[PDB]
């Protein structure tokens, strides 16, 4: 199995209310393990996973600092983008960024990324070659040159291919017992009456981890993917996920319908139907 390290960083100006709010959240494959929020009492990078307690007082200082550094940096960014878009100094705006790296099971690099956005829409992003940039609008077209001229691209690549893939392994080792685990999805179906002799059948899948799972409803061997309904997989508050998919079927004719659960911890896809 491949793995990745993703950073979600967000900056939000809030005029009249003080300095922007900066936050950083990091994940190693679906489990939050570190974070920083400028609005805590004492803004300090801190752990979100036990395995991260395995780190010396040093690590936590270098991060807390390079964090406070980025804070200033996006803080300047926000004002910069205001000139780029001829926007009012009075409005509140957002900068989102996601940077990180994926790897293969050999521990080698698979993919590296970093992309900015601004007030919810695409801004700039590092192409897959890790050498060129793709700018969304002409404002981002400027930042593109600043970085071309400052070799920011190769500066980043050094980071992705180096520091990023390396700590990924470190992490993956500190808490492999938590990150390389597989919790199997326990399932069941619920039944709900409806108008016009119709019936809604829901298929629940719980306590599973990796978040990646598939649910389908089948009738005589064909998946009714189109006349179905589901919810983006979700965290259940203890480090595992869950999902549900439902389908409307005619009353009295529901045992002709089955649910199919596809997950890493399921050697054999789960198959269930209703239990009157």
């Amino acid at each position: 199995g491949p793995h990745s390290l993703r950073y979600f960083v967000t900056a939000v100006s809030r005029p009249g209310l003080g300095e922007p709010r900066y936050m950083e959240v990091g994940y190693v494959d679906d489990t939050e393990f570190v974070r920083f929020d400028s609005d805590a009492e004492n803004p300090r990078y801190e752990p979100r996973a036990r395995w991260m307690e395995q780190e010396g007082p040093e690590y936590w200082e270098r991060e807390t600092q390079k964090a406070k550094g980025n804070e200033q940096s996006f803080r300047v960014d926000l004002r910069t983008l205001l000139g780029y878009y001829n926007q009012s100094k009075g409005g509140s705006h957002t900068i989102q960024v996601i940077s990180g790296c994926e790897v293969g099971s050999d521990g080698r690099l698979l993919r590296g990324y970093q992309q900015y956005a601004y007030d919810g829409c695409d801004y700039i992003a590092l192409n897959e070659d890790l050498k060129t940039w793709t700018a969304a609008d002409m404002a981002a077209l400027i930042t593109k040159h600043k970085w071309e001229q400052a070799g920011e691209a190769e500066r980043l690549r050094a980071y992705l291919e180096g520091t990023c893939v390396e700590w990924l392994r470190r992490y993956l080792k500190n808490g492999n017992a938590t990150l390389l685990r597989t919790d199997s999805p326990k399932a069941h179906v619920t039944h709900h009456s409806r108008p016009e002799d119709k019936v809604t059948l829901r298929c629940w899948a719980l306590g599973f981890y990796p978040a990646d799972i598939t649910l389908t409803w089948q009738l005589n061997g064909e998946e009714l993917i189109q006349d179905m309904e589901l919810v983006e997989t979700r965290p259940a508050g203890d480090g595992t996920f869950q999902k549900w998919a439902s389908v409307v079927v005619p009353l009295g004719k529901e045992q002709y319908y089955t649910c199919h659960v596809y997950h890493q911890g399921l050697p054999e896809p789960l198959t269930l139907r209703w239990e009157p």
């Binding site: 950073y7 570190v34 991060e63 980071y159």
Partner: peptide, 8 residues
């Protein structure tokens, strides 16, 4: 772990 982000 975290990157040193650049200015825009």
């Amino acid at each position: 772990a975290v990157y040193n982000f650049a200015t825009m």
